[PDB]
Amino acid sequence: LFDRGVQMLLTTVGAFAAFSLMTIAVGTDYWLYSRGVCKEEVMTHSGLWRTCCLEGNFKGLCKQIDHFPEDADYEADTAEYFLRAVRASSIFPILSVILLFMGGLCIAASEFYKTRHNIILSAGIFFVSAGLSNIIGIIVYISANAGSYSYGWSFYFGALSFIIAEMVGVLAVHMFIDRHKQLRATARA
Amino acid sequence: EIWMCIVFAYIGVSVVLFLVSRFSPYEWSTNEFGIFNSLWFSLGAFMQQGCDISPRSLSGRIVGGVWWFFTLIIISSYTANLAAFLTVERMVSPIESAEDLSKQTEIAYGTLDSGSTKEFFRRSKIAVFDKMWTYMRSAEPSVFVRTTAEGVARVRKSKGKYAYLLESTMNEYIEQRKPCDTMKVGGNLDSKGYDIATPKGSSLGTPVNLAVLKLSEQGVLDKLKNKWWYDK
Amino acid sequence: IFNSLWFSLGAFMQQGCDISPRSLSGRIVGGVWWFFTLIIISSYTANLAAFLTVERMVSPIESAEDLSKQTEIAYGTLDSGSTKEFFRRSKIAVFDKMW
Amino acid sequence: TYMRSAEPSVFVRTTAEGVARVRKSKGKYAYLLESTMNEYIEQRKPCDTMKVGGNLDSKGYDIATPKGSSLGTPVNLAVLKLSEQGVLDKLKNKWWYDKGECTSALSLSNVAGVFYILVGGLGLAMLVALIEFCYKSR
Amino acid sequence: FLTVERMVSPIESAEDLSKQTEIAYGTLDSGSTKEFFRRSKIAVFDKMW
Amino acid sequence: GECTSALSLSNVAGVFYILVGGLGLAMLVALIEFCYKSRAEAKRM
Amino acid sequence: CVDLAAEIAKHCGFKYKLTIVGDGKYGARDADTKIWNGMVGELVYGKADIAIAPLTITLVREEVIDFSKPFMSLGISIMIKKPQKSKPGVFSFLDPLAY
């Protein structure tokens, strides 16, 4: 919003914070506190991959989440199968992590060969896309679950990553706006 | 989660509109859509309120159109669900009679395990009374309770899921006892009476018979009942 | 002040506005007023729909006490009989007020 | 001709399994059986099976008597007397129905489609803007 | 209007027929139909009788 | 012998007819104005 | 059938003893040895005097024993699972209006 040295470091720390938060959200299985079989019905702390026992006979026993149940699953339309495929593979949260890493590499690459102003625009586009991918991942995860509960800290770690990704994306595009302003200012003079 | 995703979508739409309206220097500016103006446009679009600006580029107009469609659907859904909530709440009818209780099954009802009230249902010829008897005699677990005192606490314990059938005099008194969480509904199923008992051939038969009639007409009996049921 | 009143009135009726606030504080005021207006108008429409769908009619009188408390509705008994004498000789306050 | 030429075979070994097969298909299987058995199970817990349509054919349950027996005749009149007197209907009502055992907030799944459309439109707008900028740069 | 139309459900069985009174119903002046209802101890059919 | 939930087009066909009639009336009005203006210009010029 | 047996005996005024067929079969005829089993065999071979049970009235059974008029009529029906609430589709917001 002002100066140049602060904006670069602020974008760098924001990108790193978003990347670490989204990696933690994907990596840690605290996404939904709900009752379910952890191996009787018992409160469990779930994630994207493996739902794990909590306050039960054998706490700390972790089991992978059943995404395609067997034993007469009754089937459904191809849309529901696609939804389970996206939920199980988590292509959108993983794509968000990948886009955050690519934006971080682009921001880091701005120090070398600073005359290529399109790298900043590339970083901004990548951060905005990472935010959109996080949005799609959250919507898909909630829709898949909807088929008492409360969300863990990793879900809100991911939700906070989307906010920071868009906030950094705004600054990244803003930095590109000023860099082209610098070109216009010197060209006239 | 719908509200959370509405907030997230609003932020994303605002950021995308700002990006697609400003990032290109070849459009430098020609549009008053900054990050502050983009958020204001998105907020005004969601509230279906007038906007001081509209997007002019193809990408900005695409963003505006999809946001407008999303907003229209969401507002329509909110109004429709509010209407459904209020309407369904409006048709809620409390069970205010024995017929209403018979026609339903969510609220369980039972009687004493041994008494005059239980036997009245078994030997009954009215349509509603026999229907109630069929329901309780075939139900698991048994709705009948051995004692009234235990059954009275069952109504309070079952948070409205269990209903108790008992004498109206005890129903009115129990309703007036602390914590006064239970109430009497509907009308009396049958008609009984409390009488003063005297031995056959006793000399106190006729005077007591005329005494009871005297107290009823002058209002002493009605005054006595109200004193120990409502005043106390 | 006149234009602010006009803006708020137009915002409540969802009829657009010839001017919109440009400052941060004015925009905050406009946003909270817009949210209030949206919620209120949706609530009004939903309640009207619920009213028109389900028709409920109730009696002004539901018990003995309610009859005596009010006076818009009149009430009486036979000219001479057991029902009239009951109110004449009653000692409870609720019935004595009726008599 | 459909059931004979069906894979897997749609024939059940016993009636009880056919009841379970319906409950294990979530509406993807239909079982054909006598109406009396269907009405009985419909009135049993957890009450997830229902009877639809009319009777495909007509049959009857009767009281059997040995050939050349004296009780064959009075039994036959006994059934007719009870049927006209409504005793038979009451006993069916007693052992079938008398003794039988039988808003919410809008979730994200109701508007997930509009959310997907919104995000796809945002992506399309970003792609169009990037394409235009690339074309102008070239 | 639309909610009321959705709530409208036509007559299906004799149990639903017995409760409502908008549509009257009657049998023959004689024959086995009347004596069926008269001798019917079923509360569903007794109330129609 | 000898013998849904969603709103259908039939419930809102009248508004479609009104809309298309209004479009036609607008086209007719525009053409009449154009013809009148063209007639005025030719006589003057 | 126990209620029906009690009513059957009351009409005709005869005493009876309820028993369960050991074979646990309604009745059939062997293809090779031509010997009946189940309830039919009990009445044909004189192991019982009456069968008050859901015994189908059929052609092959009518020839070997006597059937009263059917006390209960029935036929083939269709059993399906209860319709149950259907999970809304992804694009279910277009439902209020036809395509």
Q: Mind spelling out the 3-state secondary structure of A26-69?
A: HHCCCCEEEEECCCCCEEEEECCCEEEECCCCCCCCEEECCCCC
Of A135, A147, B39, residue with least CA distance to D115:
A135
Residue A123 C-alpha from the chain's centroid? 16
Q: Which residues of G touch D51 (CB under 8 A)?
A: 77-79
In chain B, count of helices (H) and strands (E)? 10, 2
Q: Which amino acid is at A180?
A: H
Two tokens, residue G13: 């005024």
The CATH architecture assigned to A6-184 reads: Up-down Bundle (1.20)
The phi and psi torsions of B96 (rounded to 5 degrees) equal -110, 10
Are residues A161 and A18 in contact, defined by beta-carbon separation less than 8 angstroms?
yes
Q: Spell out the residues 6+ positions from residue E18 whose beta carbon is closer than 8 angstroms to its own.
A: E44, E45, E47, E48
Distance CA C67, CA C94 (A): 10
Are residues G72 and D92 in contact, defined by beta-carbon separation less than 8 angstroms?
yes
DSSP track, B1-59: -HHHHHHHHHHHHHHHHHHHHHS-GGG---S---HHHHHHHHHHHHTT---S----SHH
Distance CA G6, CA B195 (A): 44
Compute CA distances G51 → G1, G12, G71, whole Å.
10, 15, 13
Two tokens, residue G32: 């090779």
Residues paired with G28 in a beta bridge = G37
Experimental technique of record: cryo-EM
Q: Do F9 and G95 touch (CB under 8 A)?
A: no
| Burial class (CB within 10 angstroms; exposed 0-12, middle 13-18, buried 19+) of A71 | exposed
Q: Which residues of G touch D53 (CB under 8 A)?
A: 77-78
Q: Do B87 and C35 touch (CB under 8 A)?
A: no
Q: Do E40 and D86 touch (CB under 8 A)?
A: yes
Within 10 A of G84 (CB to CB), how many other CB atoms are there? Answer: 9
Peptide linkage before D8 cis (omega within 30 of 0): yes
- A50-53 and A42-46 beta bridge pairing: antiparallel
Give rounded-to-5 percent helix, strand, coil for chain E.
50, 0, 50
Q: Which amino acid is at A48?
A: L
Two tokens, residue B110: 């039972």
End-to-end alpha carbon distance in chain C = 61
**Touch A-D: 3+ C-beta pairs under 8 A:** yes
Q: Spell out the residues 6+ positions from residue B82 whose beta carbon is closer than 8 angstroms to its own.
A: C42, C43, C46
Are residues B163 and B101 in contact, defined by beta-carbon separation less than 8 angstroms?
yes
Two tokens, residue D70: 């004296």
The beta-carbon neighbor of E47 closest among B87, B127, B130 is B127
Distance CA G66, CA B216 (A): 71
In B, minimum Cα distance to E4 occurs at B87
Compute CA distances B27 → A173, D132, D136, whole Å.
14, 11, 10
Residues paired with G74 in a beta bridge = D59
Tell me the nearest-neighbour CA distance from D29 into chain G, angstroms: 7
- The greatest distance separating any two alpha carbons of chain A, rounded to the nearest whole angstrom, comes to 78
Resolution of the structure in the document, Å: 3.4
Of D83, B99, D53, D90, residue with least CA distance to E45:
D90
Burial C56-94 (b: 16+ CB within 10 A, else e): eeeeeeeeeeebbeeeeeeeeeeeeeeeeeeeeebeeee
Q: Residue G31 belongs to what H/E stretch?
A: none
Q: Spell out the residues 6+ positions from residue A164 whose beta carbon is closer than 8 angstroms to its own.
A: A14, A17, A18, A21
Q: Residue G84 has what DSSP assignment?
A: -
Two tokens, residue D32: 């054909």
Give the domain ranges of chain A: 6-184
In chain E, count of helices (H) and strands (E)? 4, 0
Tokens 């897997």, located at residue: D8
Distance CA B181, CA B174 (A): 9
Count CB pairs under 8 A between chains B and D.
Answer: 82
The phi and psi torsions of C7 (rounded to 5 degrees) equal -65, -45
Residues paired with A149 in a beta bridge = A34
Is the CB of G60 inside 8 Å of chain D's CB atoms?
no
Distance CA G68, CA F20 (A): 74
